[model samples]
Each structure stands twice: as C-alpha cells, then as structure tokens.
Target: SGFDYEGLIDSELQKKRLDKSYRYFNNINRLAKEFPLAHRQREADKVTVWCSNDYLALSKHPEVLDAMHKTIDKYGCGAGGTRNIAGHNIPTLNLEAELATLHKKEGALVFSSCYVANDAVLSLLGQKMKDLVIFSDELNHASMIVGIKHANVKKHIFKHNDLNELEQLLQSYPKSVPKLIAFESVYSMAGSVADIEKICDLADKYGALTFLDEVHAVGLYGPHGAGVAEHCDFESHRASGIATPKTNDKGGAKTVMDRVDMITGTLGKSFGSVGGYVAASRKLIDWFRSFAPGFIFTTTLPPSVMAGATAAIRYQRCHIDLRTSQQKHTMYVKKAFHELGIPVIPNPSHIVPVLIGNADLAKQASDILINKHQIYVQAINFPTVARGTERLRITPTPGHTNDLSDILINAVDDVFNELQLPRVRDWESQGGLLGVGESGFVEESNLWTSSQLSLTNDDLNPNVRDPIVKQLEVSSGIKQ
Candidate 1:
C-alpha cells in the first residue's frame, strides 16, 4: 500500500503545467544550459537579447565599463555613508555640475534613483507650493504617480496627448495658487511622443510651473541628446519662477529648457548608469535639496556610479551618432515587423510593441520566442497596460544587429502562423479574428467558436455542443 505520492499527471495538469511556471527561473546553476532566454540555451549558438533597456547599448561600451572600473579603484565599492556626510565625493559634485551644464540649467542635484528624484521633488514641491494643483498625464511613469501620491494634492488626470483637456484644466485653476503640469517626453509603453511645446504654452498661459520627466527621450533626442524639451523647443514657454533670457538674434530664445521650471532625468535608462537627477534654477534646486526628505534621508548615489554616469553622458554627447543609430535601429525593427505582417504598435520612437491581444497568447509568444528562437522579449500584461492589450515590449537599442531584426520578424511571423492567429493589417481594425464581416467563417465547435458577436449556450456547455468552440473560448476568450 505504498501510495499517495500523486505521481500520475492529469490532462488539465499537463496542459496548464507550463502555463504558470517559467522554464528557467530560480535555477541559475544551469542557466547557460537550460535557461531559455540565456545566450547559450538549447540549439541557440548565440544569445540574442531584446528585453533590455540598454538604449545606446552603452552597458558594454568600452569607455563606460573602463570608467566604472577606474572609479571603483579610486572610490572603492560603496559610498560607505549617506550624502551630507563623508559620502559627498568630488565625483558626485562634478557629475551634478556637468549635468547642470549639459541640461543648460543653473544647478542640478543627484538622487539614489530617478524614482527617488520624482517622489522627493513632487512631494516637496507640493508642500512648498501651497494650494498646489498637478495636471498629470494619465500615462505618466510609476515614479511620477508615487510623487503625486505623496503630494496629496488635487490632481487633474489628462488623457494622453489630449492638449485641449490639459489646457482646460490649466484654465480652471486660479491664478494665485501654484500649479504644476507634469508629464514625460516619451511615453515608453505606448511609444508615442508628447506635445512638449503645447504643454509649455499651456503652462505659460496658466502661469503654471512645468515639470517634465525625460527618462526615455533624454539620451536620444535634441541637438545633443538633451531630451524632448530641447528636441521640441521646450524653452518658448516661460515659468513664473524662472525668467527667460534674451537671445542676440530673436526677440528671445524661449527653449523648453529655458521655459520649464524643472526637469527630471534618469541615469539608469539611456545613460546606462545607476541613479537619477534633476536640473533647474538654483533656487528650485536649493529648495529640493533643503526640503526633499527622500533626498535628505536616503544615502546619496555612490562616487563610482556618479563617475560611470558621467562617462555615459559624455559618451552620449560626444558620440552623437549613437543616438541617431539607435533611432535608426528602432525604425528598422518596426519596419521589419511590419513587412513580415506582424501587428506592431505604431510610433516614431524607440520602444516597439508586438500586440498579442490576449495575456496568455502574449506570454506564450514570448516563451516560444525565447525557447525556440533564442530571443528574449517580455510579455507586458494586465495593469501594466490595459486589459486585453497585452503585448511583447521590444526595444531595439543602438548596436542591435539587422540580422537580429530579421530573426525577430521571422520568429514573430512563425509564432503567429503556428498559433493560427490573424495579423492586424490596419491601425483602426479593432475587431480580433472575427469582426463585423468576413468570408472565412469558422463554424461553431464544442472546443472552439467563431470570432463573432453572437454566443450560444452550447458554447458555454461543452457537453451540449461541439468541442472546438469550447477550446476557442478557453484559449482566446471569444464567445460563439
């Protein structure tokens, strides 16, 4: 009677076993051998990574790594203490100064991370500017949300790129009370551009201070990769606190940099570093430095990280072609996907999305790509995006290969064909598989149903109808 080990595998267990569990997680010992996303897994001769945020591919850049190594030799491993103490190193100071210059600002302050910068700045700014009202984009980053949350102020959630709504909200606020219009230069998840110029104009009209987070666009735009503000003429709109400077040629040079009161950037993103920072007027920087508890309490960024970031920024600036090449790569990836009949989210920016429609399908696509094709792409699901809008977030950083693009496009096509999924042809085509009118009518089966508006009781009850429609409903969430 040696029983009950439960060794027998049921059909449901077999079908769903690989669904929830990843093949290579928490087993790094065999990472090189068994890890699907690993460079050397299975028949993969070389690892092809698409899941990284190494925008300029600067993580492996000789200059960046060398600078970090040299910095470690000079400053040792850690800061050993928080800022405002012995941790305030020369590298940190120099980097902030350089960042200020690069951003064309009077001063800059560094934080342990971009998130801390956002949380600290938002919370502090809200407190300092009494009766503060924030006009934040609905799709702003999590850090911005945290900052706004900490502020505890009345907020106007504007739809993404809806300038009219933003303008209306700005107009509603009283002139006397301080206001901040916060948004990002590039919406990474959506890969859409923000109306920086319009935002600045609205800020000017409403007499509100403009705060922009340019983490995505910072290292890849502008004359020298400054960010969207600089790229899109953010200076024309002047803030009340920060006065605009006159230009020799024009009536005045109102750059976004000149107009916006403050700007926040991340070193961890395009810069390939480990921290974040903000550059603004001396008074604003001073206020943030003085009052931001997140900044004051948390340990300052390390000297080595500071040096590495400085190196990364310098590389981005001097090697301007790096930005151009990255943009070119993004365009190429999108074009390749399009040519291969893959439904990619449209954008003129770097981040690209391969719309999988359903979370399970998206996850499955990613898994298949990783396991079979040696490609690593993430399945962004649920709350990260909207429900039923799950996708594979693919980034084509600079130095990515054209060959890699081909592999990606082809593999995506293969996956779609293998799953017998229909490709999205037009941007406006919202109906999935089955919509209003189509010739290829799939008859109702107990296991799967036609992608139609109508539903039947047999579709729900497999025992009463064909097996095919039930399978279709179970897999794609489509009713008969």
Candidate 2:
C-alpha cells in the first residue's frame, strides 16, 4: 500500500560498509577553564583535539561566554518564531548589522546555517533573474551544489581553481545572458584556497554576478578577519595603491566584497557560535528576506547564540595573535609530518588531511588514535570524500601545542607502520599526489609507496598494536 522505504534503506546501508561505533564527544569541556587550550571529552578524559574548527578557541573566551550568559538570563532561550513573525530578536538585528559592516556591505541577512543561506540566496537569484546561468567551481561544497541544482538553472562547473577553464566557460555564454559565478574561498576537505581576485576579475569581464562562500575563511584570514576576500583586497590595494571611484572612494580601492555581488558565511565554525548569513547590497538582502522560503520558514537563532557570535566576531577582529599562533602550529605539524613521510594532502591553507586511502583502514586508524593513544581525529570517508581517498582531516587550532603536535605525529606514524599503510615520498616532489585527479577532483585509488612493507611486527609497540588488525589477519587465514 505504501512505499518500500525499508528495502531502500537496507540496500543503501549495505552498499556502503558503514560503521556507527565511533564515539563522539558527549559533554565536551574546554582544555582550560579560562584560556582554553584543548578539549575534554565528557569533562573527564582530556584528549588533544586535532580536528576542531573553533580556530581561535573563542568559544571559551570570557567575553563571549559573558555575553551569551547575560543574553540567556535576560531573554530566556529560543527566538519562538521566524524573522517575519515573533522571532526577530534584537541580538539578531545587531548581528546582521555588524556582519554587514564587517564585510563592508550595505546590508546582511542571517539564516539557520550557511547551507540555508547559500541555498536560499542561489535559489532566489535563479528564480528572479531572467535566463540566469550559474558557473560553479567543480569542488564547491555540497550546500552550494544542492542550492544551484534546486534552483533548476543552467549550471556550468569549471575545474577547481582553473581560471582558464572558468574564463573559457564565461566566454562561451553570451554577454547578454545573466550569469552568476559561485565558489568558495577555502575548500574544507582538501585545505586548498581559491584565487578570489582572479575569479572576481573573470566575473567583471563576463558581466556576471559573483557569490563567494567564505564559511571556512571568515574569522581566520584577512586583516580584520572578514575573509580571504578582504585579505585579497588589502593585498591588491597595497600593491596597486589606486582607488576605484565607482566602488569605495574612501578605502582607496574596491575590496573583494565590493567586487562580489554576494558573500555567504557561517557564524558556527570560527565564531564559536551558531547561525549563518549573507552579506550584500541592501536591495538584494531585502529581496532575499522577502522571497527566500528557507529564511522565511526557519526559526531565528536564539538570543544567546547571536550575542555570543557577535562578541566572538568582535574579539577575533582585533586578535591577530591567535591567527598567528594557528598558522605557526599548522606549519609546525605539516613540517613534522613531512619529515616522517606522512601523506598530508598538500594545500596552501591551514587544514591538514592525513591520507589513509582506504575506508576500513581509515576507520581502524581513527579507532586506534582515540582508544589507544588518547587522541581524537575522525575518519573522513565516502560520501564526504570519494572512495579510496578516505583520510583523517586534522585542523590545529591556536590551542594546539608543539608537545601535542609531536604526540599526534608519533601516534599517526605508529598507526601507519602497524598497518603497513602506504606512504608518499616527498609530497612536493611527487606533485602533491594525495590521490587527487588531474582535474582537481578526488580520484579513487589504493596505490601508494609500500617501501615500509618489509617492517615486521617487532618494529611496532607490543601494547599499541591494533587488535582489529590482528583479528582481520586471523579471519583472512594469515599466519602471525
């Protein structure tokens, strides 16, 4: 009488060898009570967090916490309705204004998440603009992809960071066709960065609108911590020393944000709070506020969350020390990993992905890291990444230390040697071969340097050897 939902679910689950046993932090506490350095799982066991997106540890900042506490005490939790209804709170309004100022935009609109913001903005743009065409980066986040797809517009995906391909695509489309270029500043999975200025240049040449996803770049890069766009603007202006009269006369030149039609970002990651936003011209934001279903239907963020996020953003704006520390830590870890021949996916950004190349082995490595070494790094496998390119995405925050970095590197080395996992030789000399295809997408492959295969079990620690590996060996009828 009804749909075969059970059969469909079972088939999907079986197709992917899914494991649901990985334990996540239930009641996580900061490494410190005041200036937090690490994370405590369940407020008991202290584990060095190497995969956190809370870049500056602003979540534990006293100012942010105080604002959140004061707001909660004053307003009680929950917005109670949508923005159009009763849920439009004072903190949200202030946050939107502050974000607009931060991005140097005329106005801004807050959403449930960046996903919602991107989805809503793209869908609205496609539906409203006549004969709208979207030129997207091949490696754009799933959120932007889904949004563009749902908008049901003509989309052309250019090769990732390939300005030539993007220019070619733009040239193919008539200048009269309303076009939008949608891309991200920092790709999350691969730790790669985008050439914002070049992309904006292409948009100008093509007579197209530009949408930049700065979700991973905001509060981490740039002089004022706006995003890579702001950073690029400052760099460009400093080099050129010329102002564009058409955009911002006071600032000496139009910033990257000025060049772009819209910018979407999240307050949850670097801000150490919840919610997302789109910053643009006042008219565009108003249009989104009036027409976007995602923004209209969803309940607004809690007063506490908005307050905390605002405080965090303000603090991050002036805190260059935290940003410096995070970059140093990232470089330190990457250098150490390189010395040990660990396969770190090479990207110019701060993210560090340790390649595992197999799903089961990736999970097993994560299990051993958490259970035996008292370290926590989640296994990233399909469909987050393609099959045979599973990895451990590690992000070192300002709180991560040299001692912690050493421990993480050593533990990972131990796991690799124990499992006889493949290693890459000189990641730079090998053309940064982390299984990424020539087209910049992740390629499926199990091939890697097996030079260390001759190493016996005697080389590994007797106690730290993975029991799962031994069990797998026995099951496969291999002699110890």
Candidate 3:
C-alpha cells in the first residue's frame, strides 16, 4: 500500500491553522544602509523592524562590512568543504580563536549555529558519558530540549531559574555520578534571567558542570562583551576589561563567571553575523572537535561570514558604548510602556515582551501594527510560548533612539486601544497575565547597574580592547 504522506502533512498543518497558531511570515527586507527600517513585499512599503536579534546593529557596521568583503575576495564565497576537508582555513581558525579569547576559555569550536553547538555538545555528551544526569531550565531553548531528547539520558526539568528544584535534583544523585546543569543567561521569550551565581554555587557544591547559553546576551552584556556571566562581577570586570578564569580571590579574584564549564553563544544576534560556537576547556573543545558529528560532517560557514563575525566581536569588545546605548534604549521604551498602561511582561533583561493573552489576538495586534503603524514585531504564539501567554516580543537596538522609541510607544498605545487590549487597570481588575498590568507597584531594576551605564568606551581597559584577530594574524603569519 502507498503512503498518503502529503495528505497526512496537510491534515497536521490544519491543526495549527485551526488553533490560530499557524505562523505567516511577513516578507521583510531589512536594509543594511538604513537599519531598523525594512521593506515589505513592496520595496517602497518600508516598516521599522523592532524584533530583530541584531542587538548592536553590527550587521551594518562598516568595519564588519569591510572585513566580509575582504575575506570574500581572499577566500571566495564558500569554505569549499567541512572543517576536516578544505575548510579548516584562517577565518575559521581566527573566529574560533576570537570566540575562545572573548569568553576567556581555553578553546572554542564553531558550529553551523548555536542550535548545532547545543545539540552536538549535549547530545554527544549524553550519549558518550555513562549515566550522565542533566538538569535543564524548563524554558531552555528548543535546540537544547531536542538535544536532551536525542541524548536519551536521564534528565531533570527544573522550574525556570528555580535553584531549590535544581538543587533537589542535584542532591538526588551522588557527587560520584556525572551531572551537568544546562540553562540560559537570558531566556529570550519571557525575558527571564537565571540565577547564575547561585546556580554556580549549586554546581560547585554538587560537583556538576554548568552550560550557559548566552546567545541573546553575548554582544549586549558583560564588560568585554563576554555576556551576563562576566557582567555578574561588573566592577571587577569593568576594571580589568578581561574575564580571566579561576581568580585566586586572595584580595578578590571572584568566583563570578570563570567557573562556568561551557558557554554557547551566537554570532547571529549581537555579533550581527552568523553561526554559533562553544567556548570551554581545551580538552572539552578538542573532544568536540575530534568526535562530534555536527562538527565533523557539516560544511564550515563561508570564510567571509566568519571574518565578519570576528570583526563584530572585536568591535563590540572595545565598544562598551554599544551595549550601554542598547540598554538605555530598552529602559526608555520599557519605562514609556509601563507609564502608558501597556502590558509589558516584566523582566530585568533587555527583552520588552508585551503580553497579548489570546493567540488570534496577538497575531491581529502585530498585523495591525505592521499594516497601520508601520512597526514590525513578530508575535509569539503556541509551541513558542504557552497558549494563553502569546506576546509581541519587542527588542530595541541601539538604533532605536529616543525619537524612534517615541514613535514605537505611540503606535503600541494606539494598537492596544484599537484592539481594546487589557491595560494595567484592566489586568489589575481581572487578575494579571504574566505580571503585565499587575495590581501592585512592582519593584524592577535594570540588569546593568547605573554606574556601569555612566562609563564610556574610554573607560575600558586598552589591553582587552585590542582585537584578538591581530594577535592571531601575527601568530599565523597572515597579513592584509
């Protein structure tokens, strides 16, 4: 008998449509020249893109562009093969070296995306290690979940950032048994921050390794742009501009971030290029490099992309201003929304998630914003988020200046009115949804302290400000 796969697929897709969860992608051509603004299907019909992950706008940086062009000329379009074949070239090596240096790790490995990095590392580790128990944040990204599922190992799903639940799971297994805690520095959807310091304390006490996915936070957090982990010890990191591991703390070496066993991040977001990577001990890195099929089988990213990514990391490492400005814009927008009775799901991180309770309602609001207000923010729906908690995740970049933010604020306000969406009082009267429009005065603070925001690029240490690529080029005997 013949399989009716096409009919079955169509029937499955029907469920999504029926449930109002089917995603219809808006065709957006985000222009490099005039960022934060992009054209839809019609070239002249431009909209201000507010949902892009390019946190620092590095994708349009002149330096990044120049590096990409130069690398493309030097190495041509493709890597020609996977890393083991013809692709283990200079750009590949340099990007990985830069990644390692940025995170203060002994080594790093580049993968197609952080998705691949997480999957390969987690899946392989689970498969290879005998009875490895993994404790993961409930809201850890789909890639991590898939990896864990694929690994087919014992795992405990801890409530998001619940240290007690994590500890209980950790305690369930003896120190002799291998354990790893997988979590994110910033949960993208709800914009929650994990308790990294406390988590690290638990890991140390339980003799477990920690995996921190800093994909959303890498370019926008930390002193030298290492991420939230480095940002944990703000004063010390800002003073040195480098996150060196295992400080004796004789005076105060600090057990802030250097204790993290593995950190996975993306070049696609803050870095404004493409690809994902993992930074960790040399042994772990080399082990992945030598063993993982994700690394061994896939073609390396084009040399140009890697070069641009490297340039971005180096540029961001020196420019603390980029991170600050982005945060400032975020704060500005959040403050405006809060005051205006817009329902923003509260979180300390940069994410500005405006809650829209129903799936169809969330999609309608975004559609209205795009069609009428010319603001583009994708709505979060089921599978991506819980059914009733759909949201329009507005991410403000450095480019989203006060003036621009004013436009966004007014538009969101109008949309809320048009949709008759619940306001702070509305939610207060009818109970709250995800802390938005809650009853009482909620205490909230920015992740980056006030003092840190006051500082500029000049305040950063000159040593760490220097691009790692220059050092790599010198060592590898590469020149312009």
Top lDDT model: 3
Q: What are the lDDT figures for the candidates, one per model?
A: 0.69, 0.75, 0.86
By lDDT rank, best first, the candidates go 3, 2, 1
lDDT of 2 by residue, 1-480 (tens): 899999998977766534532334434455546333344545456666677788777878888889989998999899888876888767876788668766767778889999999999988888887489999998899999999988888999998888999999999988988999999988899877888877888888889999999998887776456787766654442222222224332454576667888999999889998889998887788778878999888788899999999888766655555666777788889889878878888776778899887888998898888778877788887778877778998998888878888899999999999888777653344455554222354532211112222223233223222111111111112244
Q: Judged by lDDT against the true structure, how good is candidate 3?
A: 0.86
Model 2 Cα shift for residue 162 (angstroms): 1.5
How close to the true structure is residue 296 of candidate 3, measured as C-alpha lDDT? 89
| Native-referenced Cα lDDT, model 2 | 0.75
Comparing 2 with 3 on lDDT, the higher-scoring candidate is 3
Off-target runs (Cα >4 Å) in candidate 2 are 1-3, 18-43, 235-252, 426-480
Q: Write the per-residue lDDT of candidate 1 for residues 1-480, one digit (tens) a residue.
A: 786455555655665464443333411111222211334433335456776776876666677778878988988888887666667667777678667756778778888888989999999877766689999999999999999988888899999889999888888777877899999988887677777777888888888889898888877765346777765542221111112335411355566576778889988877877888898987778778777787777776777778888777766654546765666677788777767667776665678778777877887887787668767788887567887677889888766768767878788889888876547654235544322122353422211012211322222212211111111111111234
Rank list by TM-score: 3, 2, 1
In terms of TM-score, how similar is model 3 to the real structure? Answer: 0.95
Provide the TM-score for each candidate, comma-separated.
Answer: 0.78, 0.83, 0.95
